Automatic annotation (TrEMBL), chain A:
This is NADH dehydrogenase [ubiquinone] 1 alpha subcomplex subunit 10, mitochondrial. Keywords: Electron transport, FAD, Flavoprotein, GTP-binding, Metal-binding, Mitochondrion, Nucleotide-binding, Phosphoprotein, Respiratory chain, Transit peptide, Transport, Ubiquinone. It comes from Sus scrofa (Pig). InterPro entries: Deoxyribonucleoside_kinase, DNK_dom, NDUFA10, P-loop_NTPase. Belongs to the complex I NDUFA10 subunit family. ADP binds at residues 30, 33, 81, 95, 102, 124, 129, 132, 184, 189. Its cofactor is FAD. One of its GO terms (cellular component) is mitochondrial matrix. GO terms for biological process: mitochondrial electron transport, NADH to ubiquinone.
UniProtKB/TrEMBL annotation, chain E:
Complex I is composed of 45 different subunits. Interacts with BCAP31. The chain holds residues 53 to 150 of 154 of the full protein. Belongs to the complex I NDUFB11 subunit family. Keywords: Electron transport, Membrane, Mitochondrion, Mitochondrion inner membrane, Respiratory chain, Signal, Transit peptide, Transmembrane, Transmembrane helix, Transport. The keyword Protein biosynthesis does not apply. It is found in: Mitochondrion inner membrane. Residues 1-22 are annotated as: Disordered. The chain crosses the membrane at residues 37-58. Accessory subunit of the mitochondrial membrane respiratory chain NADH dehydrogenase (Complex I), that is believed not to be involved in catalysis. Complex I functions in the transfer of electrons from NADH to the respiratory chain. The immediate electron acceptor for the enzyme is believed to be ubiquinone. This is NADH dehydrogenase [ubiquinone] 1 beta subcomplex subunit 11, mitochondrial. GO terms for cellular component: mitochondrial inner membrane. It is a single-pass membrane protein.
From TrEMBL, chain G:
InterPro entries: NDUFA11. Belongs to the complex I NDUFA11 subunit family. Disulfide bonds join 17-74, 94-114. This is NADH dehydrogenase [ubiquinone] 1 alpha subcomplex subunit 11. Its main location: mitochondrion. PANTHER family: NADH DEHYDROGENASE [UBIQUINONE] 1 ALPHA SUBCOMPLEX SUBUNIT 11, NADH-UBIQUINONE OXIDOREDUCTASE SUBUNIT. It is found in: Mitochondrion inner membrane. One of its GO terms (cellular component) is mitochondrial inner membrane. GO terms for biological process: mitochondrial electron transport, NADH to ubiquinone. It is a multi-pass membrane protein. Pfam families: Tim17 (PF02466).
Automatic annotation (TrEMBL), chain I:
This is NADH dehydrogenase [ubiquinone] 1 subunit C2. One of its GO terms (biological process) is mitochondrial electron transport, NADH to ubiquinone. Its main location: mitochondrion. It comes from the Eukaryota. It comes from Sus scrofa (Pig). PANTHER family: NADH DEHYDROGENASE [UBIQUINONE] 1 SUBUNIT C2-RELATED, NADH-UBIQUINONE OXIDOREDUCTASE SUBUNIT B14.5B.
Length: 318, 57, 105, 347, 98, 459, 140, 98, 121, 52
């Protein structure tokens, strides 16, 4: 797809239909939002994107298998759970990497929607990722400069994307979440404190949900309410479509958005803004070594299709 | 003292390399005043036009 | 880079208005058609360097026709001398120059 | 902007330049300039920003003033000659006014002030067009009237352009402003040989166009507009920054790279006309341009700067947009010195 | 200030992995062959054969030729009474002095 | 002459298409073979130069320098194998290609028949050198050093370009043969004076004249070992070769215009030798010694007597070899102690015995010990200058005394005394380093048996 | 422009030192007025009086430099009896540079200006004697 | 030349000086542009009529057409500045420096 | 502008018909080989930029680069040779038609000319 | 980094341009016209003050 396709006649407004919507199922840690998102995707027929983790980009690029931590992410959620005030900047590095992963995820979702026409059901979004960062800052895990860098990066990337038509939020309370975590099994998750979850909920209910309600509809369900997929699906099928700036979109802005989301490097252009925060600033020697290690991975040396080691052939005529 | 510091590391360098680079830096600061106002360099254009008409006839 | 596509393809896009001696509607001649014709025919093919110095009399006549600077200077001198003579009473304008004789048809 | 509308505007800019380079009537040259400005302003403002609007307004004001002065010069030449053809202008005052107007259009100093601002305001895509294609028409007009050009005024403008371009380039950290000042210096270099030999001006224009196309396309391929942002490109794509270093060395005028061709031929032609002080001063002043190019080469490839953690994700993806002319422009701007005797084809 | 690798330890002695090292690379076989190549093509060829080639280089400087010509000229000058070396590099009869 | 140019070019695809375990081996093999082939250029005629074609020629001045370059390339590879061992394959290939391009450019400078082609290539030599100095240098001063060097050279050389083009326009040709046969005297007008300067200052910057020498210490200290090797062995002799080539069209104005440069060099030799007496950095001491040695070549060229030119050529070859070996020894010491401070590591005569002998022999050659070619060149230049003026002998003798003093002081400070206690990383010297020193020394000692080869075209 | 140039050059070297100095002063004053106008245009003064003061300072500096250069060159030509020696112009240029340093009240500026100005004035004198063309007419 | 030519050239010069000397508003600069265009129209028209260059009587109309095209360009740029800054003041155009 | 205003010059014509009287550049010309080398380097840089095997990937693309560069270089060299031949022809004709401006000089041998000797002491 | 390579006291106060060159929009909101469609108006039935 390119300017030629738009000129020749390929317009996205034709592809958009009743169920051509992007749905973000939000919620606090271990709120069961994933099952609700999957059930919404199954019944509405939309495509389901599992929440973007550290190795989400590894799934879309290459073999779809996660790479090493040294190469893909240089951060650990388990380390953040164990030591959230580490001097390695692992907390903010993980937060920035997760924001970048969700930015790529949103781009892939919008692309899929604008090309195939099928709707998308995402778990949380770049618009909801700031909740974790604000919780970390309130807990004191990250300093003010990290928050400033995150805001600077976000204000340059999120503006070029349309907010989701529907925002489904699960509202499992903090003590129930604590009980689920202490029964989940993962000791690292068990290491999560109470004020962290409380601040996550505070951010969700003070900034995200009101601001999202300013743009579009925001469906809300408790633990019991979210367990009825038919009830949640019926609400989506009868929401007022006026909500969201998507009706204010023509083929021009749609062409711009489709051009943007197809170029992943253009999507992630401002993720690597040259702000030299000690928490994310990788040194020259380490950068060189890690890049050389990445280049030596099978299939990661040349462009996709020209790596003879991974079975690609006809390269002389390709 | 008289050679190693005084001439080589000080005067020889001060006479040619250091002085020239400093002059170039000052001229760079002057030229790139970082103002960006049309009201100024359009007046400069007027002055230039008048001067060219006077000199080159 | 004067890419002379007009002379190559034979098209005439703007050479019809370059001079006043070219063809004009209803054959309305230019005020200095003769002088420009002489200047152009003199300086045709000999090059600009030669044309500046060789066909200089023709160009001077053309400029004089166009601007009449020297003719105006002569007329101004005549007018000034006539005014000076009238001030001293050394001259008397003729009746045909005083609006006393009927001009010929 | 609709792609059809953008293509029509680009074709209108090109048609204006071709009208300037094709007509034999002064009125049509002025018409081509007007069409170029009319179709260039929205191209400058393709991406709507306050900086883009400011750049468009400044460019429009400068080009409008230049076009008014050019038309006044044309009218005076008609008054004193009764001629519209592009030939030996017959009035010195009209010649001076036209020279000032054309220098303002080219950006020759002291009409250089708008170039760094308009270039910085617009994107790289528009900056490339502004610094490469917008120099064709005024240079062609100057080459057609080189006989009537007062050599003193043109030489003073060229020398001032080189000096000011070098001095301005030293204090700049924005890549677009560095490119604008380098363009000013190279325009001075081109206009230095206009009264002597126009084919050398054409050769310098071609070499500069190739070098600037290569540099701007590399910047687009790196999506870098500052030294710090360009520094990160060593980690993701070392080939791009190495080619950028080579092209910067070429722009400095260092042999055996292609950038030595225009300066060498210009010095030759100016020494053939017994001018020895002016080419020497120009060669010495080119060292400032060479200085800021070298500083950029250090920050980009010769030395490695600290990257950011998020470049790990960018490592996985490959560039989608493909500029087919970039390798050819890089090669022609670096390894064409063994081919100078091809100068005759430009005659 | 940055997440950077600790300075690598000072260059590991190649004697550690292979006590016979000859310097050069790390692989013992390529070390041996690099040493053989360097010593051979440096001493046995371009040094020995080079010095012999430059020692028996044919006399194109014409030193022996010049000496023989000088001997013949001296014989002619002394036998015939000529004053050995003249005082003019060119014959005055062909000089049109102002 | 293409018998040497074509293999030098073919070195590049060879190294680029060679396995990562064979770049150094192949490079060394074929650089040594190229040097062996270029040895055939030493068969110079007595009077006429070897005119291979319209573009390339070689006389008894060009041939020794060509052989020196073709011989020095393998030495540079061997010296640079060590520190460039953990680098990636692509960057190692890039470094090798930079060295090859430098060698090719040097060959085409020393063989060029046209002054403008000579200028083009002799300024083209800057790019590989600058890159080598600013990319693979170890310190943070490598960036300033590269700028100083580059800008000193360019500010010297651009007026040379202007003057060469002016001469082409006026005389009709820049070919060395034609410009030598169709030579004409220069008048004492200011225009001729400034043409003389424009032609002279470019090479005066290259072989560092006292006052324009500030770039040499920075360049030689901050650059890697191979870069310092070329800069000291060939890139300084470029200026001397250019001056000896161009002085043909600069007479008789030289007689009167050489006084400032003659005095500058004859005092700068003493000044720089005294500076060497009080240096704390080994590489800086070697660089200032190089300045002092090149002052003699400058004097010899500016005097324009046959003995002066012979001494200049001999000194150029000898000094190139000696300075390259000294830089290699300093590089070994640095790679051992990771510091260039002379007083840091002491008593190396007891830990590295053979390296001590190499240091001793290199210092003896540096101080012009008979019958080394260093002394041959120095004595020829001294005799020429004494014939020029008897007063010169005072400065010449003082310079010789101070050179011996600082060379033996370096030998005593480095390879003598009590060993540094805390230093424990001094391992036994490798076969590679000893072979490098042997390849530096043996041609130098052998040249004393056939000094006629490096005595220049005036022998 | 060329009127002042021929008002200065037509005066023979080492003759009419007062008139030569006056012509050099006029040239310097014109240059200073040009510089003042450009400075006012590019770097606007806060008040009209401030602009007048800036113009006066620049004009006085330039005119003093020109007057000192002319007087020094003519006096050197008179005393040394060598009208065609560039050393006279070198001394005049160094004197002008010293006056520039005095006006700016900086010894380093004074010394640097003396050196560069003296060199440039000597170059100008050499070009006048030999016939060097800064702006060469197209001849090919 | 006749005095009317002098007056029209002086009017063009005055309009050019006015355009080059901004005060506050961008509207007045466009006014000076239109004034210069009008002066050029009058000059060209007088020249064509006086010399009876019949075929060139269409030149002033083309000049006027492109004049009001430039005026429309200026007006559109003016509205964008006002939309982006609230006033058409020329001082708001300050982001781009040097 | 020299050759631009030559009589009979047809505008926008790359090779005039009179150029055919000159020998075409040989297909083994070193300049043509250098044009092919430039094309090959362009192909290598194209491979390098797109992150594919530099020396093996896309043989057809590199072949096209070389062919186009050689083709345009051949035509460019032919035009250059034609223009230099035109320059020499015009110079010779002008010299022949202006004998006064280019007079033969008296040929004095060095035995007759007095060139001053400047000693080197 | 920064606006210029050799900043001065005046220039040091000036910050680098935005990363995407999008200058933050100004808050100089355009004021409306509070026309008084007052009582006297014929369409206001004589006793209606309409502040629009």
């Amino acid at each position: 797809y390119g300017p030629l396709a738009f000129v020749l006649g390929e317009r996205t407004t034709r592809k958009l239909t009743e169920t051509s919507k992007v749905i973000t199922v939000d919620g606090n840690i271990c709120s069961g939002k994933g099952r609700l998102a999957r059930e919404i995707a199954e019944k509405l027929g939309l495509r389901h994107f599992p929440e973007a983790g550290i190795h989400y980009a590894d799934s879309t690029t290459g073999d779809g298998k996660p790479l090493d931590v040294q190469l893909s992410g240089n951060c650990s959620l388990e380390k953040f759970y164990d030591d959230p005030k580490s001097n390695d900047g692992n907390s903010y590095r993980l937060q920035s990497w997760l924001y970048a992963s969700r930015l790529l995820q949103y781009a892939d979702a919008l692309e899929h929607l604008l090309s195939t026409g099928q709707g998308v059901v995402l778990e949380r979004s770049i618009y909801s990722d700031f909740v974790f960062l604000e919780a970390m800052y309130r807990q004191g895990f990250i300093r003010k400069q990290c928050v400033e860098h995150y805001n600077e990066v976000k204000k340059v990337t999120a503006c070029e994307y349309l907010p989701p038509h529907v925002v489904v939020y699960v509202d499992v309370p903090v003590p129930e979440i604590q009980s689920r975590i202490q029964k989940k099994g993962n000791p690292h998750e068990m290491k999560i404190t109470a004020a962290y979850l409380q601040d996550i909920e505070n951010a969700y209910k003070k900034t995200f949900l009101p601001e999202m309600s300013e743009k579009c509809e925001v469906l809300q369900y408790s633990a019991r309410e979210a367990e009825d997929a038919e009830k949640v699906v019926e609400d989506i099928e009868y929401l007022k479509c006026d909500k969201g700036p998507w009706p204010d979109q023509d083929d021009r802005t749609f062409h711009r958005l489709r051009m943007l989301v197809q170029n992943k490097l253009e999507v992630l252009n401002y993720t690597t803004i040259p702000v030299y925060l000690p928490e994310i600033t990788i040194g020259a020697h380490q950068s060189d070594r890690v890049f050389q290690k990445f280049t030596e991975l099978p299939g990661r040396k040349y462009s996709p299709g020209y790596n003879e080691d991974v079975g690609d052939k006809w390269i002389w005529l390709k | 003292k008289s050679a190693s510091s005084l001439l080589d590391l000080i005067w020889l360098e001060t006479i040619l390399p250091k002085t020239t680079s400093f002059i170039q830096m000052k001229m760079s600061i002057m030229v790139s005043n970082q103002k960006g106002l049309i009201k100024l360099y359009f007046l400069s254009f007027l002055i230039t036009i008048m001067i060219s008409m006077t000199l080159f006839n | 880079p004067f890419f002379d596509v007009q002379k190559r393809l034979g098209l005439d896009l703007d050479r019809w208005m370059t001079i006043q001696s070219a063809e004009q509607p209803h054959k309305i001649p230019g005020r200095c058609h003769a002088f420009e014709k002489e200047w152009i025919e003199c300086a045709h093919g000999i090059g600009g360097i030669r044309a500046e110095k060789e066909c200089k009399i023709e160009f001077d006549d053309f400029v004089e026709c166009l601007l009449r600077q020297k003719t105006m200077k002569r007329l101004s001198a005549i007018k000034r001398q006539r005014d000076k003579l009238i001030k001293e009473g050394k001259y008397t304008p003729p009746p045909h120059h005083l609006g006393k004789e009927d001009p010929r048809p | 902007m609709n792609p059809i509308i953008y293509t029509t505007l680009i074709m209108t800019v090109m048609s204006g330049t071709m009208l300037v380079m094709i007509s034999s009537h002064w009125l049509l040259i002025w018409i081509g300039f007007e069409m170029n400005l009319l179709a260039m302003i929205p191209v400058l403002m393709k991406n709507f920003n306050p900086r883009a609007t400011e750049a468009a307004t400044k460019y429009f004001l400068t080009q409008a003033t230049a076009s008014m002065m050019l038309m006044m010069a044309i009218i005076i030449n008609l008054l004193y000659s009764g001629q519209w053809t592009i030939t030996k202008m017959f009035n010195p005052v009209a010649m001076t006014m036209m020279t000032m107007a054309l220098a303002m259009k080219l950006g020759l100093s002291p009409f250089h002030f708008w170039v760094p601002e308009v270039t910085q305001g617009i994107s790289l895509q528009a900056g490339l067009l502004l610094l490469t294609w917008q120099k064709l028409a005024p240079l062609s007009v100057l080459c057609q009237i080189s006989q009537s050009i007062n050599p003193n005024l043109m030489l003073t403008m060229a020398m001032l352009s080189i000096l000011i371009g070098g001095w301005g380039g030293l204090n700049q950290t924005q890549l677009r402003k560095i490119m604008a000042y380098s363009s000013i210096a190279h325009m001075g270099w081109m206009t230095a040989v206009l009264p002597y030999n126009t084919t050398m001006t054409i050769l310098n224009l071609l070499i500069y166009i190739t070098m600037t196309l290569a540099m701007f396309m590399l910047l687009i391929h790196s999506s870098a507009t500052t030294t710090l942002s360009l520094s990160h490109t060593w980690n993701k794509m070392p080939v791009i920054t190495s080619l950028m270093m080579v092209t910067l060395l070429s722009m400095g005028g260092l042999p055996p790279l292609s950038g030595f061709m225009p300066k060498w031929m210009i010095i030759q032609e100016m020494t053939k006309n017994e001018s020895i002080i002016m080419p020497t001063l120009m060669a010495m002043t080119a060292l400032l341009n060479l200085y800021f190019y070298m500083r950029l080469a250090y920050s980009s490839s010769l030395t490695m700067f600290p990257s950011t953690n998020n470049m790990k994700m960018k490592w996985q993806f490959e560039h989608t947009k493909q500029m087919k002319l970039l390798p050819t422009m890089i090669v022609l701007s670096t390894l064409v010195l063994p081919m100078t005797p091809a100068l005759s084809s430009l005659n | 200030i940055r997440l950077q690798e600790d300075p690598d330890p000072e260059d590991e002695n190649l004697y550690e992995k292979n006590p016979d090292s000859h310097g050069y690379d790390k692989d013992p076989i390529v070390d041996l062959w690099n040493m053989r190549v360097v010593f051979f093509f440096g001493f046995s060829i371009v040094l020995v054969l080079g010095s012999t080639f430059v020692a028996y280089l044919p006399d194109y400087r014409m030193q022996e030729w010049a000496r023989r010509e000088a001997e013949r000229l001296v014989k002619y000058r002394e036998a015939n009474g000529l004053p050995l070396m003249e005082s003019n590099c060119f014959d005055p009869n062909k000089i049109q002095l102002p | 002459m293409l018998k040497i140019i074509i293999p030098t070019t073919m070195l590049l695809p060879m190294t680029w298409m060679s396995k990562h375990n064979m770049i150094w081996i192949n490079a060394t093999v074929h650089s040594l073979l190229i040097s062996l082939i270029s040895l055939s250029l030493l068969n110079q005629l007595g009077e006429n130069s070897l005119n291979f074609s319209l573009t390339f020629f070689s006389d008894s001045l060009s041939a020794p320098l060509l052989v020196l370059t073709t011989w020095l390339l393998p030495l540079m590879l061997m010296a640079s194998q060590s520190h460039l061992s953990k680098e990636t394959t692509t960057r190692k290939k890039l470094y090798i290609t930079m060295l090859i391009l430098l060698q090719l450019f040097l060959i085409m400078t020393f063989t060029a028949t046209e002054l403008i082609l000579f200028y083009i290539l002799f300024e083209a030599t800057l790019v590989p050198t600058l890159i080598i100095i600013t990319r693979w240098g170890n310190q943070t001063e490598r960036l300033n050093a590269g700028l100083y060097f580059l800008f000193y050279t360019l500010a010297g050389s651009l007026p040379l370009l202007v003057a060469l083009v002016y001469i082409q326009n006026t005389t009709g040709s820049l070919n060395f043969l034609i410009i030598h046969y169709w030579s004409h005297p220069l008048s004492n007008s200011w225009s001729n004076i400034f043409m003389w300067l424009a032609c002279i200052m470019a090479f005066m910057v290259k072989m560092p004249l006292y006052g324009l020498h500030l770039w040499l210490p920075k360049a030689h200290v901050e650059a890697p070992i191979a870069g310092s090797m070329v800069l000291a062995a060939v890139l300084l002799k470029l200026g001397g070769y250019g001056m000896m080539r161009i002085t043909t069209i600069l007479n008789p104005l030289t007689n009167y215009m050489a006084y400032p440069f003659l005095m500058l060099s004859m005092w700068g030799m003493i000044m720089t030798s005294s500076i060497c007496l009080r240096q704390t950095d080994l590489k800086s001491l070697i660089a200032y010694s190089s300045v002092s040695h090149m002052a003699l070549v400058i004097v010899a060229i500016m005097i324009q007597t046959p003995w002066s030119f012979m001494g200049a050529t001999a000194l150029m070859i000898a000094h190139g070899l000696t300075s390259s070996m000294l830089f290699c020894l300093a590089n070994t010491n640095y790679e051992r102690v990771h510091s260039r401070t002379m007083i840091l590591a002491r008593g190396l005569q007891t830990l590295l015995p053979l390296m001590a002998t190499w240091w001793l022999m290199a210092s003896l050659t540096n101080l012009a010990l008979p019958p080394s070619i260093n002394l041959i060149g120095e004595l020829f230049i001294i005799t020429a200058s004494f014939s020029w003026s008897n007063i010169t002998i005072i400065l010449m003798g003082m310079n010789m005394m101070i050179t011996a003093l600082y060379s033996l002081y370096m030998l005593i400070t480095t390879q003598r005394g009590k060993y540094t206690h805390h230093i424990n990383n001094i391992k036994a010297s490798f076969t590679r380093e000893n072979a490098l020193m042997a390849l530096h020394i043996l041609p130098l000692l052998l040249l004393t048996l056939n000094p006629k080869m490096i005595l220049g075209p005036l022998y | 422009a060329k009127t002042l140039l021929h008002k200065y050059s037509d005066i023979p070297e080492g003759t009419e030192c007062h008139r030569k100095a006056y012509a050099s002063t006029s040239i310097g004053g014109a240059t200073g007025l040009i510089v003042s106008a450009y400075s006012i245009a590019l770097k606007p003064p806060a008040s009209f009086l401030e602009g007048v003061a800036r113009t006066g300072r620049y004009t006085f500096t330039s005119a003093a430099i020109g007057a000192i250069f002319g007087l020094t060159s003519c006096i050197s030509a008179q005393v040394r009896e060598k009208p065609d020696d560039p050393l006279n112009y070198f001394i005049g240029g160094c004197a002008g540079g010293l006056t520039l340093g005095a006006r700016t009240r900086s010894y380093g500026i004074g010394a640097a200006a003396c050196a560069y100005m003296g060199l440039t004035a000597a170059l100008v004198k050499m070009g006048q004697l030999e016939g060097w063309q800064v702006f060469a007419e197209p001849k090919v | 030349m006749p005095l009317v030519y002098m007056n029209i050239i002086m009017a063009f010069a005055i309009a050019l000086a006015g355009l080059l000397m901004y005060r506050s508003h961008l509207m007045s600069s466009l006014l000076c542009l239109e004034g210069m265009m009008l002066s050029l129209f009058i000059m060209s028209t007088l020249i064509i009529l006086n010399t009876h260059f019949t075929l060139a009587n269409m030149m002033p109309i083309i000049l006027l057409v492109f004049a009001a095209c430039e005026a429309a360009l200026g007006l559109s740029l003016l509205v964008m500045v006002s939309n982006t800054y609230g006033t058409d003041y020329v001082q708001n155009l300050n982001l781009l420096q040097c | 502008t020299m050759m631009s205003g030559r009589p009979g010059r047809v505008p926008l014509q790359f090779l005039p018909n009179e150029a055919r009287s000159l020998p075409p550049p040989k297909l083994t010309d070193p300049r043509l080989v250098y044009m092919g080398f430039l094309g090959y380097c362009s192909g290598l840089i194209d491979n390098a930029i797109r992150r594919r095997p530099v020396v093996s990937a896309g043989l057809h693309r590199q072949l096209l680069y070389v062919t186009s560069f050689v083709f345009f270089g051949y035509y460019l060299l032919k035009r250059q040779d034609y223009m230099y031949a035109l320059r020499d022809h015009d110079m010779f004709a002008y010299v022949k038609s202006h004998p006064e401006d280019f007079p033969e000089k008296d040929k004095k041998t060095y035995g007759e000319i007095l060139e001053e000797f400047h000693p080197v002491r | 980094g920064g606006a210029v390579m050799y900043p001065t006291k005046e220039t040091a106060h000036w910050k680098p341009p935005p990363w995407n060159d999008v200058d933050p929009p100004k808050d100089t909101l355009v004021s409306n016209l509070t026309l008084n469609f007052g009582p006297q108006h014929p369409a206001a039935h004589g006793v209606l003050r309409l502040v629009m």
